[PDB]
Design a protein around this motif. Sequence first.
Motif, PDB file in Angstrom:
ATOM      1  N   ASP A 153       8.168  15.061  -3.382  1.00  0.00           N
ATOM      2  CA  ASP A 153       7.452  15.251  -4.646  1.00  0.00           C
ATOM      3  C   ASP A 153       6.000  14.836  -4.484  1.00  0.00           C
ATOM      4  O   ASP A 153       5.098  15.452  -5.129  1.00  0.00           O
ATOM      5  CB  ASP A 153       8.104  14.451  -5.739  1.00  0.00           C
ATOM      6  N   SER A 154       5.709  13.785  -3.720  1.00  0.00           N
ATOM      7  CA  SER A 154       4.361  13.255  -3.426  1.00  0.00           C
ATOM      8  C   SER A 154       4.394  12.861  -1.951  1.00  0.00           C
ATOM      9  O   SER A 154       5.436  12.309  -1.495  1.00  0.00           O
ATOM     10  CB  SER A 154       4.071  12.110  -4.347  1.00  0.00           C
ATOM     11  N   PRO A 155       3.335  13.067  -1.166  1.00  0.00           N
ATOM     12  CA  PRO A 155       3.388  12.838   0.274  1.00  0.00           C
ATOM     13  C   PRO A 155       3.175  11.351   0.646  1.00  0.00           C
ATOM     14  O   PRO A 155       2.199  10.996   1.331  1.00  0.00           O
ATOM     15  CB  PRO A 155       2.226  13.719   0.763  1.00  0.00           C
ATOM     16  N   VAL A 156       4.122  10.524   0.233  1.00  0.00           N
ATOM     17  CA  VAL A 156       3.982   9.058   0.312  1.00  0.00           C
ATOM     18  C   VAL A 156       5.316   8.465   0.686  1.00  0.00           C
ATOM     19  O   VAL A 156       6.403   9.033   0.401  1.00  0.00           O
ATOM     20  CB  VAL A 156       3.516   8.479  -1.015  1.00  0.00           C
ATOM     21  N   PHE A 157       5.244   7.248   1.255  1.00  0.00           N
ATOM     22  CA  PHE A 157       6.430   6.378   1.262  1.00  0.00           C
ATOM     23  C   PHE A 157       5.940   4.983   0.910  1.00  0.00           C
ATOM     24  O   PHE A 157       4.730   4.695   1.045  1.00  0.00           O
ATOM     25  CB  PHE A 157       7.230   6.448   2.564  1.00  0.00           C
ATOM     26  N   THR A 158       6.844   4.142   0.436  1.00  0.00           N
ATOM     27  CA  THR A 158       6.471   2.776   0.038  1.00  0.00           C
ATOM     28  C   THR A 158       7.402   1.821   0.715  1.00  0.00           C
ATOM     29  O   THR A 158       8.591   2.092   0.931  1.00  0.00           O
ATOM     30  CB  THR A 158       6.480   2.609  -1.481  1.00  0.00           C
ATOM     31  N   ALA A 159       6.827   0.669   1.083  1.00  0.00           N
ATOM     32  CA  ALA A 159       7.542  -0.469   1.653  1.00  0.00           C
ATOM     33  C   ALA A 159       7.512  -1.612   0.678  1.00  0.00           C
ATOM     34  O   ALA A 159       6.422  -2.090   0.293  1.00  0.00           O
ATOM     35  CB  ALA A 159       6.978  -0.883   2.975  1.00  0.00           C
ATOM     36  N   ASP A 160       8.686  -2.104   0.303  1.00  0.00           N
ATOM     37  CA  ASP A 160       8.841  -3.213  -0.630  1.00  0.00           C
ATOM     38  C   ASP A 160       9.778  -4.202   0.017  1.00  0.00           C
ATOM     39  O   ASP A 160      10.980  -4.233  -0.304  1.00  0.00           O
ATOM     40  CB  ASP A 160       9.336  -2.715  -1.975  1.00  0.00           C
ATOM     41  N   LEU A 161       9.272  -4.980   0.956  1.00  0.00           N
ATOM     42  CA  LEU A 161      10.103  -5.875   1.758  1.00  0.00           C
ATOM     43  C   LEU A 161      10.365  -7.151   0.984  1.00  0.00           C
ATOM     44  O   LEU A 161       9.478  -7.697   0.333  1.00  0.00           O
ATOM     45  CB  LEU A 161       9.461  -6.216   3.078  1.00  0.00           C
ATOM     46  N   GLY A 162      11.573  -7.684   1.099  1.00  0.00           N
ATOM     47  CA  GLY A 162      11.937  -8.937   0.444  1.00  0.00           C
ATOM     48  C   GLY A 162      11.662 -10.151   1.295  1.00  0.00           C
ATOM     49  O   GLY A 162      11.734 -10.123   2.476  1.00  0.00           O
ATOM     50  N   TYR A 163      11.446 -11.279   0.648  1.00  0.00           N
ATOM     51  CA  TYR A 163      11.423 -12.606   1.262  1.00  0.00           C
ATOM     52  C   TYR A 163      12.823 -13.174   1.187  1.00  0.00           C
ATOM     53  O   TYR A 163      13.333 -13.452   0.075  1.00  0.00           O
ATOM     54  CB  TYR A 163      10.422 -13.541   0.581  1.00  0.00           C
TER      55      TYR A 163
END
Length: 330
Positions: A153-163
């Motif tokens: 849908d959008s040319p992106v990826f996201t990283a949401d790493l946990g502690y």
Amino acid sequence: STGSATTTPIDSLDDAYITPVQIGTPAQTLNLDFDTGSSDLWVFSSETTASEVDGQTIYTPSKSTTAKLLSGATWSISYGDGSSSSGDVYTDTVSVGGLTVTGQAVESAKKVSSSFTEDSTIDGLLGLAFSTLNTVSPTQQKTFFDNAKASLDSPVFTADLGYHAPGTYNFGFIDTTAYTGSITYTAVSTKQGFWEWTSTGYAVGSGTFKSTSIDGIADTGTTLLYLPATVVSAYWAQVSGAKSSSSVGGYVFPCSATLPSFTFGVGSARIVIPGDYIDFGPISTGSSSCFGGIQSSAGIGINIFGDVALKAAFVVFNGATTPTLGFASK
Ligand code: NA
């Protein structure tokens, strides 16, 4: 299309994160280390030297009705930690979090170095740097992201790493519920094939912010934060008894310490790494010397915003025609 997959620390120190990936038909699920600092999707396989496999789940192309040998193609990669792997190549169907790519190059390991064998929790790597770094010869291959891009849908990826907790990799969308405030975007250079950007400076604890340009890479496949020796010395000078140990291989500190936070700049915005994120625990079991999570990049030839930094933020990897990185607090 979109995809969304949970990523889980492999151990109590957040040394790396694994994300389940479906390969082949019927699906074979392997737990891969998503690495924004490399561009090969490689797996432990039925071809991997048996003495180099110890607990990993393997990909068996002969059991996948969609696998096809990519005839003549080989690969061989060396990482910044001295580890390596090599092998041959299949194309197959690969799905991450419900997002499917057909015809993905799946690099089957024939050989892996000792650090891979010794880590039973990592079944291979999924590279998310630019495809210019892919090692397949004689025909370079595309990353999973580059093959998915046009369908997203959008040319992106996201990283949401946990502690010390699971987090998320999303493909094709921004989850506006996953961060606080606004996202600050910053320019990327693709000249070295990395997500390379320039931080605007740093602060140590409650100290004043130092405005200074720090070029580095956003690298989910690196555990620690590697910065210039000046910056790292200024951080560890605020911890009583911290020192650089040539025998241990970096800065160590008394396990009795309370560590200060570390702030890095993204344009006019600031990301704060809590002190706790910088503690990597005893250098050896039972030791009262603890290993630091901020280390010098001198001799590595690049600064690395690894997991210590990235897990303090919601990070957008924008693969539009002009790539950019975005950072938000969370
Ligand atoms: Na270590």
